[PDB]
Amino acid sequence: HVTKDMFPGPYPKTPEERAAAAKKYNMRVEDYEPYPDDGMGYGDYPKLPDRS
Amino acid sequence: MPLVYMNIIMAFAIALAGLLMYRSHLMSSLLCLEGMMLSLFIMSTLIILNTHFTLANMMPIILLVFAACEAALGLSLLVMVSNTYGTDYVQNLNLLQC
Amino acid sequence: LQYGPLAFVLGERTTRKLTETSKVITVDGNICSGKGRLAREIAEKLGLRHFPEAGIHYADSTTGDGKPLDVQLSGNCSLEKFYDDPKSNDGNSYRLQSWLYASRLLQYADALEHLLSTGQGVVLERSIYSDFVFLEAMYRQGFIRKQCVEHYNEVKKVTACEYLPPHVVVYVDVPVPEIQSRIQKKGNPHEMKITAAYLQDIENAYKKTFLPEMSEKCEVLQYSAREAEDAEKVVEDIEYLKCDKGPWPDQDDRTFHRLRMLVQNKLEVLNYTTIPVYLPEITIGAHQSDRVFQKFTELPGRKYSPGYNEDVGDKWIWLK
Amino acid sequence: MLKIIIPTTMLLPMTWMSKHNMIWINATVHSLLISLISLSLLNQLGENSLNFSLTFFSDSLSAPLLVLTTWLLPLMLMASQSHLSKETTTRKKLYITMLILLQLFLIMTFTATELILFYILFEATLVPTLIIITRWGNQTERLNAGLYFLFYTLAGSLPLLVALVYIQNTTGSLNFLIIHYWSHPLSNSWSNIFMWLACIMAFMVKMPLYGLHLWLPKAHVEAPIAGSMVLAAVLLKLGGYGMMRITTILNPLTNYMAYPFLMLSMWGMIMTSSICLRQTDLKSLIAYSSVSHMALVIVAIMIQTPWSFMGATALMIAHGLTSSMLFCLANTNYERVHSRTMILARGLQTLLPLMATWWLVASLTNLALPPSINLIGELFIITASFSWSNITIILMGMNMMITALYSLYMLITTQRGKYTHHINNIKPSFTRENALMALHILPLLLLTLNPKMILGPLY
Amino acid sequence: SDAPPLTLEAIKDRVLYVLKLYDKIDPEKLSVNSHFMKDLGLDSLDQVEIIMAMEDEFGFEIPDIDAEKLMCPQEIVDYIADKKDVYE
Amino acid sequence: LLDLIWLETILPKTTSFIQMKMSIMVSNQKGLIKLYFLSFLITIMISMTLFNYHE
Amino acid sequence: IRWTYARSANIYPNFRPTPKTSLLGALFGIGPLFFWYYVFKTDRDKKEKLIQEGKLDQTFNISY
Amino acid sequence: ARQWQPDVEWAEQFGGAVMYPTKETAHWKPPPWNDVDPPKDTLVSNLTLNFGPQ
Amino acid sequence: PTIRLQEDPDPEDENLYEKNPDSHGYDKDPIVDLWNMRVVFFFGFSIVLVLGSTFVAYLPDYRMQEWARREAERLVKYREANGLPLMESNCFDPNKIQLPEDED
Amino acid sequence: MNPIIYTTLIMTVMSGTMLVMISSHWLLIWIGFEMNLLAMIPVLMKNFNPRATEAATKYFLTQATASMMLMMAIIINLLYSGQWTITKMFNPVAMTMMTMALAMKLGLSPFHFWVPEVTQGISLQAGLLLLTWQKLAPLSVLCQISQSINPNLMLTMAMLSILIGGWGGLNQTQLRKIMAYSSIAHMGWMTAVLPYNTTMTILNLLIYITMTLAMFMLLIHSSATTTLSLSHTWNKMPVITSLMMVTLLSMGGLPPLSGFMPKWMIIQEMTKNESIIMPTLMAMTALLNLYFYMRLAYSSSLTMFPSTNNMKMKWQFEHTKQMKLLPTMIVLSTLVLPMTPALSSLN
């Protein structure tokens, strides 16, 4: 029941894309920050704090 | 080889070039086909006459016969093409691609 | 000797069987008009074969045993639930319309096969040429989408071009209030739900598109409700017609041979009904398609070819 | 040899003539009987091979592989019959036909006396596997997997074919006996280098070699359980077998040529063992472990010593059995929870204790616990590599550690801890699954008593 | 590929270009909001001629009932955008 | 970096990309006999010069 | 599901050849292979030259 | 759970006039269902002649 | 419709234990399931495993290991009884070997 | 078209081909080609539509140019030696002209452009005839004059044909264009081995004709001309789709199917002549044909595509016309590899 637009996508550039991605991952837009947009393949996934 | 042989072979080459490079009208390409046939007739006739190959004297006539068939064939197709488009331009024959 | 190129080559011709009473006739009219009795009476008086109006299970009548099959294995649509919920989001309306057009195409093919093989004429109730009026009504009442109309037009364009239109088009004219009175007197609860706008749309489509179009290639005989009850006058009016208008006089043995090759081989007739245009209303998923096909193949006489099902009494199978 | 081939062919009309409710029973019973009959090829002569006819021959290397194939067929049927319950009778018969055709092609491949017939059957194995994967796989990725599994193979095999026929034009024969007896040295030239590459690369990609292995995680993950069993257990061994047959004409070129492949194999076994430590999918972990073990086998074949060949044979047999068991163990939980994620279902030892015991035994055999034959093959290869070069132990040692580190990891992830609270559909283990686990594991432990059966011709 | 995605700006520029080519219009007193009869002092026949020029420029016919409503360059721009389905 | 990106990039993805580009180049023709027969003339000249003179 | 998909399938669609990416790939891919080739080739060349000189003390070395 | 099977969106990849759609072939249209194109409105003009008065 | 297609819903998996509390996991029909269990167990554990192991354990010495041991014992006894070396550095007789006549 | 007229036209096509086959005189071979073209033009146009007319026109133009070049080569050969027998040409220029003319007749690259268009523009029966029977006469003529072949030009055209067939087939969704590109690649395979062993050419032609006949008959039986139309066949005739998948696998040259036998033989023959690079490149290139065959198999038989409701009606009707040679053609297209040595009967 997880549809096509609920999966991680490419790196977000526009603020509307950032808000959409933040809502997709169930995060506050102020709290959502993806990995830097190099070619390492992280894409849209949020960069969470490195705590264990 | 005599210079006449070279002239006839050059005539065939010119007719082939004219057929291979298309302008709009299909009738011009059909005329180029007919010219190619005429040059072939002349060349074969000259060779057969020079060598005195008697039984080959009927060979050019047979050529003409099939030339007519080809000519008729082409004209038939042209009619249908015109009937579809009101024109014999080859740029209308592009419904099929590669 | 099954009819084919060999039968045409030696002997069998179509024009030798036409006997001036072939006259493909269709008797059209609005909903609940008495076109059925008029069609039956015309067939009886003129000695023609009558075809009852093609319904959801017309194809079942001509295959296997004539008994109808289950709705989920044949049709997969319901007219009663179209009357109940014409705007249902399961796409029953256009599915029913497409199935009915396919049924009418098959029935027209059967009628043409009969006429071209025996020379006897046929009488039809509606046709593929007039199936569209309901569609237009369905579109003007908001029952179907525009995409369904476009798909219907594609299918009609690739299907109906292959056949000859009927000789005679008979139209039974009944006003809308009389239609509503007849519907109320009929008693079936589902037809009670037909609004006047739907019937008016059907009537408008008929009178504005079908008759003007057919009159160019066929002769049209219009009759009111009162004068449609006397079959004798209609029959004698048909008997004194000059069929010098449409493409039928232009038909010779070779075109008849092509048409007869086409009207048999029902799969070639139905070829373009299932064009791969993916409308949600008529598209069936892979799992449902597989399940329904497996259910169909388990019917008593459908697993093999007609003469090879031993469970319905076929014998001598090993020598056939 | 027809005494094994003909019954395998007879399995086809027998399964096509059975009832709808009796296909599995008949197929399993007669496959077990065929395995029992094939068990008689282990009586090897020592000096030479068992030459049945001009077409077929048996060897101390071929016989364990044939026995493994014949034994793996009934286990594949047992694992298959669960997830094919809702399937139609005809399509079930087609699936069983695919498995039978695969077995027939494998048993004819392992005994062909000429290289061209070997090539024909070794390529013919592609069609049933591709059909199985692409038709009865579960996810949308299966198609892609099939494409990989096809073309990665063929890009390797088409040059070999050319090389093969070229050899027969210069030598006059491709029969293995004549090829062996009339062997002559390979000079150092570009032509000989490219002939070596064409003779080696198909078997390299079938192993698979590190760098040419991308087809394997896809194909093994997306395949159905029987497909994964046959892919890991038997098919990966084909290239290995091929190498041991083809290296007899490649000397002394192999001494210098083998360097890039040895470096790739050692460093790639390290890489794939490390990859297993971070894998969210349970099937992918087993696939990468297979890659590491086959890298060890590649090193053993490349260094070309009798101890290395014995270790390679033992490791091929042991890996086949262990990997098939691990795939079946994963498939049980996948059927329970309909997902392949490793951390989804945890603490399963509390709910399924005997399955936890099977998991523990499979994990112990995977990390080469002595005196299991996995350890025997690994130790023989390590000793031969040490003789080849003393430094190799470093890499070897590293691999050993990492293997345990991921093996127990998988166990600890799936059996220990606390169960997931919301997963409430974990029913008790069926007798079929337990019997499949036992039929996987008991021959593995039994073979320890008589290791010489699986040590190959160099014994 | 076909013509690029025509936008509102290009439509407006083309409309003013063909409007300034009209001889009965002062090239600098014309603005996008100028009413033909009022600001430009044109007649009904001049407006009809302007619609003919519009039809020639944008390659599609305009019926009389609509053309009776186009009374300034901006209305022409809106009509062309609606007919060509242009959002920006 | 290696298994999911670069080993993918070099062997299979490059093959797919190159074959797709070549297929697009080869198959995308306008279907006009004028261009085809011009190419035929070029081919005839090339065969008559580069091959017929080498014998 | 999102975590698994991002860790497995979403990586290549979001990959760009970059000087950092290219350099790291080249290093971590081919550097170790060449290093190990150099080490093993040096060791084996030394051993073979030592054998050719008739000095290795290979007594009782009959298993290989 | 059940095996994945293609759906409409998966099917439409193979419904265009050509694989691998580029910018030039995006305007290509699939051929008609039957191999029959609609007739063109290429009206053939008749020849108009003045017969007389002279 | 806001739907894309007419599709069957994904069914829920059925428990074999629900209708057959002792169902062996082989088939829905209890009789066929029980006989599948019986045939699998009898032909795997009973016949292939037990008989096969026994047959493999008692395979005749076709590899000629006892023969080799006895031959080695005889040769060692003879060679050490007559003061001859236990093994020769040359596997083949140098007398039947014709080396190239000149090495320079 | 009258059935008698169609029978006469088919017989005229076949008799022109046979006249080419049995003639010892160059003029009679040319006459056979002319008769074949004359009778073959109407067959392409049996079902009248603009596309069929365009295909017929393109075919006529190509074949007429080829015939004129053919006659010019004959006349030059006669000029440089008073010979009419088809044994071996006496002038390299005439040989080049003849080779180019026969390549244009066969549709080898770079004269391949007309084949996909003409195949797409005609029906499946006309396509079957065009892609099976029309290859016999030029191949027979090429086989007779094989010892005069310049190997460089012939091999260049064959390699170009293989490459272009693969690349063009990679991009198609219409089944007729896929078949045409397969034909181009297979013709390249046929002509690659011609200067070495004409028996291999005959064997390749026979295998290709059998598989093409099976393919076209399966496409006529399930009346589909596009990929998506063929995606519906499984819901009406699954056996047809299964047999089609097996035939497609055979067309890809996969062992142990019949399609593997020609390439294999060709490859080994080439290795007898110290030709190693070219066969390797040809096989690695035929991988592309295999790829798009596998794509068609994926869409047609290995997965189940969504269907339509009206298909239920088609469940109630059988096929009134049966093709008598389809099962034998399928069996020959798949299971004839073990009978490989029988090729000695072809020489």
Ligand SMILES: CCCCCCCCCCCCCCCCC[C@@H](O)O[C@H](CO[C@H](O)CCCCCCCCCCCCCCC)COP(=O)(O)OCC[N+](C)(C)C
């Ligand atoms: C769950 C409950 C657990 C607790 C209960 C357990 C009770 C005690 C069990 C512990 C048993 C202790 C084992 C000790 C070994 C004794 C048996 C041993 O002596 O037999 C071996 C013999 O074993 C067999 O040879 C090896 C097993 C054969 C393996 C084949 C498996 C069957 C085929 C199935 C397919 C497998 C596919 C993979 C194949 C490659 C050794 O043979 P060998 O010392 O020399 O004998 C020399 C004298 N001979 C030659 C005259 C006979």
Ligand SMILES: CCCCCCCC/C=C\CCCCCCCC(=O)O[C@H](COC(=O)CCCCCCC/C=C/CCCCCCCC)COP(=O)(O)OCCN
């Ligand atoms: C999944 C991807 C894996 C792909 C593996 C591909 C590796 C293939 C190895 C090379 C293939 C070509 C070998 C051809 C068969 C050898 C036959 C032979 O030995 O004959 C040679 C012919 O050798 C050649 O011609 C080889 C030329 C190569 C042609 C094709 C080039 C393909 C690319 C080669 C380099 C890549 C090789 C390793 C790739 C590994 C995979 C990444 C000499 O014969 P003669 O003509 O008689 O000459 C001696 C007397 N004058």
Ligand SMILES: CCCCCCCCCCCC(=O)SCCNC(=O)CCNC(=O)[C@H](O)C(C)(C)COP(=O)(O)O
């Ligand atoms: C090449 C040589 C050509 C020369 C020959 C030309 C021959 C054509 C002659 C045609 C004559 C006619 O049709 S006669 C035309 C028909 N009659 C009228 O137009 C008068 C009634 N109209 C009005 O009064 C309006 O209010 C109006 C004043 C227009 C205000 O227009 P606006 O709404 O804008 O304000």
Ligand SMILES: Nc1ncnc2c1ncn2[C@@H]1O[C@H](COP(=O)(O)OP(=O)(O)O)[C@@H](O)[C@H]1O
């Ligand atoms: N194409 C159609 N679409 C929807 N309903 C149809 C269609 N054709 C027939 N029907 C239904 O068939 C029912 C009875 O048919 P009709 O001819 O109108 O009355 P009668 O049975 O008296 O002849 C009507 O309720 C009509 O709606």
